[PDB]
Amino acid sequence: SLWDVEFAKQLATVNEQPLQNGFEELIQWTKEGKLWEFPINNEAGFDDDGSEFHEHIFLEKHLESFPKQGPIRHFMELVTCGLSKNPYLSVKQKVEHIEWFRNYFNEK
Amino acid sequence: HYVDWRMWRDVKRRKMAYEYADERLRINSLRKNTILPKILQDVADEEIAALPRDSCPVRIRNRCVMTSRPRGVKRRWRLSRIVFRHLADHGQLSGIQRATW
Amino acid sequence: PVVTISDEPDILYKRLSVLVKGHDKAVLDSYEYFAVLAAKELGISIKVHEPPRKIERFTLLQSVHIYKKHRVQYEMRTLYRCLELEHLTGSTADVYLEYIQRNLPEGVAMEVTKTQLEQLPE
Amino acid sequence: PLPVRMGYPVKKGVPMAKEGNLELLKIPNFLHLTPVAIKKHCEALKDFCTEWPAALDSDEKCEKHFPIEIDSTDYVSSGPSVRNPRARVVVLRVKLSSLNLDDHAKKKLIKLVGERYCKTTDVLTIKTDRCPLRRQNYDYAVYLLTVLYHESWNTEEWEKSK
Amino acid sequence: SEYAFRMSRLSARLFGEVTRPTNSKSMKVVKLFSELPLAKKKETYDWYPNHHTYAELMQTLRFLGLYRDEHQDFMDEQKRLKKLRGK
Amino acid sequence: KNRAARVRVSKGDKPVTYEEAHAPHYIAHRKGWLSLHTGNLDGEDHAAERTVEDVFLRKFMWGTFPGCLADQLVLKRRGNQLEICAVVLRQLSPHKYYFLVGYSETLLSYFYKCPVRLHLQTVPSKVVYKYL
Lengths: 108, 101, 122, 162, 87, 132
What we know:
The structure is cut from a larger assembly and holds chains A, B, C, D, E and F. By secondary structure, chain E is mainly α. Chain E has helices at 2-15, 26-34, 53-64, 70-85.
């Protein structure tokens, strides 16, 4: 398949939109990611994963409530509220934080 | 590979305070508190009192790069007024001018 | 156009609130004039004026070593132009902002476009 | 090809150099695209002519049709980085007055929210910005509002005495 | 108020937030445990560049013959002169 | 007095440019701004990193050409475009010019993830302000 690869390279070199013009260079920049995804919608990045509009807040069940006899449950609820009010976190991050908190608190 | 030394001291202190993130995080979050038990508060107190220098998160003093000056510095440009004034005098900053009101 | 003709419903856009920010007066004037010209060519009734300026004159001395009886400041004659488009579609506004950003004024004259959707409640 | 003179005079003569001047470069630079090229670009952009509804302005009928008013902007970024932590703004500014279908929920919603419920126009703007995005934030806000309305449809037993 | 407390408890049970009230000194701990503390500010590790990788890049560029190091070369020459005069 | 960037009278036919002859109280009056970057803006934030990047780019471009940059550059950020307006002087041949320009352009475009390009200042007269 030597001739096949040769023809493939010839195609990728010629048929592909070459330069020879300023508009062609602009198109090459836009395709190679050199230029921002105009219009700058701030979508090309900063996704922070998904939430499915029901994962970051619904934390009532996922709590692991210590025997209700002290302020530990209230503190955990406050921590969950603070995490939900912070839009700079994800599901896995919040889960790991809650797990580490519960551990460091009631390891025993 | 800096020229001065105060810049390197600040770099080392800031990076040591940033690296040991969890330790100082828990310490500052649990030490001074009137709620919750005091066992963990005393644990954090002992941890912060027994550990050596170059780790405490209280090592943040605004300084510049061109001079490494702590007196009069802003977080907006991470440089001092002198460096800002030196750059403005050369017309290398937009919008900066004399107080014409 | 060359944007894959679809048949799905679009989002109801309303009010493309814009706010230019800069320092130089002539640059902001040129930017707002070009924006108004492009908007009029597109055919969108809008209004333009001048909101209050925002200047936080930071503090600094006049010399470098030692001087207090003679102080100085570094302010700016910044201006703002709210080139808001009252009620329009999202695709046209997006193409307009794309054409703008393809050659926006460096540094000064930075726009802060803002839309206001609607959609159905429940 | 425009020998434009730029510079401050010395005493009593003519500005400095003729061709490229330092000031000319310091200008934000708009020499590109002349009025003719501007008209050409406008004729190119003539495409995209989506119709718009004439629902009467005045900030009344527009809200009556759809009370919710989400904000989905697209700020411009600076430097060579496109990551602009500013596209997550979202507010569910729904006009409760436009709804006007609360038999006993009038006494429930007034208390289930603190910094809301006005007098002239009920601006129920529950800043729902808990998730790390915008569209799913608005979806969760709408779901929570629907759940709250369904729960208020069957008011509690001790909600009358306030 | 008792009625206000019961209403807040009911809302928290429905919404899914903090229920009973207490001292407001827990917000600081919540922020320090979840949000940014103090040393992890946006202008700390970036306040000063390490200048190690940058210095190596500048040295490589100088070796390639496409850069200039005036201060460094002058200091090296002065050090060589001092050593010749030294020590 | 104040000699922030000015040069008092001395001779008559001495070398001097626009940036090498201005007062501190004329930064924006009789003199322009050599850096219309997206840093020192208001009410917009982000200024430290922008100024650092501008200084780095200016120093790199000054170090590129050996003995041909009298005044600083005029960076322009049109979103994702880095336009350079250097005060370059005719050095030698055009082959070396094109080679170095292309090399620097490709290097900066592959490093900063943003297209970069410069243009020489082919003018047979500097921007002399005061005759001095």
